[PDB]
Amino acid sequence: AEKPKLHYFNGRGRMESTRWLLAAAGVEFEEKFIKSAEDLDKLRNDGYLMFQQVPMVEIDGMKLVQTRAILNYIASKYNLYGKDIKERALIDMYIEGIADLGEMIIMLPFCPPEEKDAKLALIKEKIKNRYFPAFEKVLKSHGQDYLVGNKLSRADIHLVELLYYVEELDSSLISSFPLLKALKTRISNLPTVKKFLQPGSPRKPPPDEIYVRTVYNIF
């Protein structure tokens, strides 16, 4: 059985939460980068893409598409999805809030220039008034090092990845949230995450204008 092989553009977009989770889990993977519309159309025409889209991951005999299908499978396989049905409800609730905020961040570079200020201001408002208070409250309420079950789960990994993007956006947004600051440091120091955070890993950068244009070209 192979290393999982990740099909996506050479950028963050919709594959980056899978790169984080696999790296957090200590799992070696390979990437086949889509550089053109022709690369994508060949995957489609070869029947690799159930819904004609990427992300797609080749893992344990499957060609899985859909971010959540990929991540649930990885989380479940590497015991990062809790130990029972009630922990999974907490985990799902948390990571779905993270996905919603995440989505706004992923979509942001693609919005018309005249809308950016308004959209960014709204993401900053939701971070401050909605999402950071929600997660700080979880940490504050049980006083434990991990969001759920007193042990590392995907929710920790997904949230910390998000705290890194929020820092790139505005380093002060986290300032009033000391338990989130502390979660970020703790998880960043786990050997697997520490290595993924270091130069030269598969961690992808923020999108620049050449990438924004390229992603269009790939559609």
What φ, ψ does residue 74 adopt, rounded to 5°?
Answer: -60, -50
Judged by beta carbon, residue 2 or residue 103, the one nearer ligand GSH is 103
Element (H, E) at 132: helix 132-142
Q: Which amino acid is at 188?
A: S
In the complex, least distance from residue 1 CB atom to a second copy, rounded to whole angstroms: 13
- Residue 134 binding: pick among ligand GSH, a second copy, none (C-beta 5-8 Å cut-off by kind): a second copy
- Minimum CB distance to a second copy smaller for 98 or for 152: 98
Structure tokens at 110: 């693609």
Which of the listed partners (ligand GSH, a second copy, none) does 64 bind, with a CB threshold of 5 to 8 Å by partner kind? a second copy
User: Where along the sequence are the contacts to a second copy (CB under 8 A)?
Assistant: 50-52, 60, 62, 64-69, 72-73, 76-77, 85-86, 88-90, 92-93, 96-97, 100, 130-131, 134
Q: How far apart are CA 121 and CA 156, in angstroms?
A: 26
**Based on CB atoms, which residue is closest to a second copy, 137 or 195?**
137
Task: Tell me: is residue 54 an annotated ligand-binding position.
Answer: yes
Q: Please, are residues 156 and 149 in contact by the beta-carbon 8 Å criterion? A: no
Using alpha carbons, list the distances in angstroms from residue 218 to 3, 66, 215.
26, 18, 5
Output 64 or 174, the one with its CB closest to a second copy.
64
Least distance from C-beta 155 to a second copy, angstroms?
11
Q: Is 67 labelled as part of a ligand binding site?
A: yes
From CA 15, how far away is CA 78, in angstroms rounded? 18
Nearest CB to ligand GSH, comparing residues 63 and 181: 63
37 binds, among a second copy, ligand GSH, none (CB under 5 to 8 A by kind): none
Interface with ligand GSH by CB under 6 A: which residues? 13-14, 52-55, 66-67, 96, 100, 219
Q: Which residues pair with 8 in a beta bridge?
A: 33
Tokens encoding 103? 């989505």
DSSP 85: H
Residue nearest to ligand GSH (CB): 53
Give the C-alpha distances (Å, rounded to integers) separating 11 from 66, 77, 206: 17, 25, 8
Residues contributing to the annotated binding site: 8, 44, 53-54, 66-67
Residues contributing to the annotated binding site for glutathione: 8, 44, 53-54, 66-67
